[PDB]
């Protein structure tokens, strides 16, 4: 899953967006992901 892995990686707010494209679901749960665990 390329949006899986992108949060996992503690990727930045951009790269949510586009790992998760287009999605905005997943999108939204990269970025709390990322807000909150990195």
């Known amino acids: 899953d390329e ?3 992108a949060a ?3 990727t930045n ?3 949510c967006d ?3 494209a287009p ?3 997943a ?3 990269c ?3 990322i807000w909150n665990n990195c």
């Open 8 to 10: 996992q990686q503690c």
């Open 31 to 33: 970025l709390m992901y």
């Open 18 to 20: 586009a790992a998760c």
């Open 27 to 29: 999108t939204m749960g």
């Open 3 to 5: 949006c899986a892995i």
């Open 13 to 15: 707010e951009e790269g």
């Open 23 to 25: 999605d905005p679901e």
